[PDB]
Write a protein that binds this ligand. Structure first.
Ligand code: 601
Length: 330
């Protein structure tokens, strides 16, 4: 089997991407944030505290003939940005882009943090990291990908995120028309439950490439690119007037600037992030200070190749017995 679904930016900044997902019978379509940095499929639901729902589409398990309470199971998750959610669990039929899993754990939110309430366009998350990170207790549950894997033509999914445009998540096949050149594969560590890999270095603009190992995670659920302070300082030093602002919470730059590109290494290959991808616009409406798309990972504890990086590439998440990541230019 295979599946293919279009993923769409939620706003003009590509702050996140949503992908339609069919849950239950008859189908209830919710727009979920596919998240390769977590392993829970959770949704706004008829059980979510009313004051914490603001425009989202909800899953109502009582209207699904295939929903079953997973008796006694609860979940609770918190993300690196400080967001969180929690609730109980149903199993139901879930389909993505024509690919169907029966008996998928669908985690129904009773509570969500304000960040989720405020994101009217995001009806929940669909985790695509390793199932060892799943938060359901007392019986840990498998991700949609993990459940689908044995049925897939190939045990892979791909992320092809657009810059200010829709893109695609494919399951079970590699679309050889979706990228240029060749895909370079690199080793993954699953020890922390993430798609964790080691970049071989970086360059700023037309500058020389610096060979240096940068461990990090491929996280479609993080907006920005978070790298070591040394690397990030070297980037922003090439932008006149750029500075780190403790008041704003990161590097800002004059909105009159033209940003240089940023290159990261994948083995002997190189992925170039155009300067435009690094512009996250005015810090507040009407401001001439703009927020940068490359920020320090210091005080996160891990480097994060978020959407800013991933959208510059066609990315293969290879879930074979020994997982690997592949990157191609596009
Ligand atoms: C507030 N929202 C929509 C979030 C979405 C995703 C994440 C995240 O860290 N995913 N790996 C955090 C927050």
């Amino acid at each position: 089997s295979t599946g293919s679904a279009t993923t769409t930016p939620i706003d003009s900044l590509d702050d996140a991407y949503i992908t339609p997902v069919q849950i239950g019978t008859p189908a209830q379509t919710l727009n979920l944030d596919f998240d390769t940095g977590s392993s829970d499929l959770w949704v706004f639901s008829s059980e979510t505290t009313a004051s914490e729902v603001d425009g989202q589409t909800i899953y109502t398990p009582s209207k699904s003939t295939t929903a079953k309470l997973l008796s006694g199971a609860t979940w609770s998750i918190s993300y690196g940005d400080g967001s969180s959610s929690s609730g109980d669990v149903y199993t139901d039929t879930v389909s993505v882009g024509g690919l169907t899993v029966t008996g998928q754990a669908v985690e129904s939110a009773k509570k969500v943090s304000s960040s989720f309430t405020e994101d009217s366009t995001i009806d929940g998350l669909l985790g695509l990291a390793f199932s060892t990170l799943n938060t359901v207790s007392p019986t840990q549950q498998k991700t949609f990908f993990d459940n689908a894997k044995a049925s897939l033509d190939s045990p892979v999914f791909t992320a092809d995120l657009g810059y200010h445009a829709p893109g695609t998540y494919n399951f079970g096949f590699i679309d050889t028309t979706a990228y240029t050149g060749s895909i370079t594969y690199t080793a993954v560590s699953t020890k922390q439950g993430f798609w964790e890999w080691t970049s071989t270095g970086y360059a700023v603009g037309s500058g020389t490439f610096k060979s240096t190992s940068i461990d990090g995670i491929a996280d479609t659920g993080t907006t920005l690119l978070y790298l070591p302070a040394t690397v990030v300082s070297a980037y922003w030093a090439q932008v006149s007037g750029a500075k780190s602002s403790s008041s704003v919470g990161g590097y800002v730059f004059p909105c009159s600037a033209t940003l240089p590109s940023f290159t990261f290494g994948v083995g002997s290959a190189r992925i170039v992030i155009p300067g435009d991808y690094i512009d996250f616009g005015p810090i507040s409406t009407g401001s001439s200070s703009c927020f940068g798309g490359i920020q320090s990972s210091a005080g996160i504890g891990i480097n994060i190749f978020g959407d800013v990086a991933l959208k510059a590439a066609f990315v293969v998440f290879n879930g074979a017995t020994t997982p690997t990541l592949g990157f191609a230019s596009k």
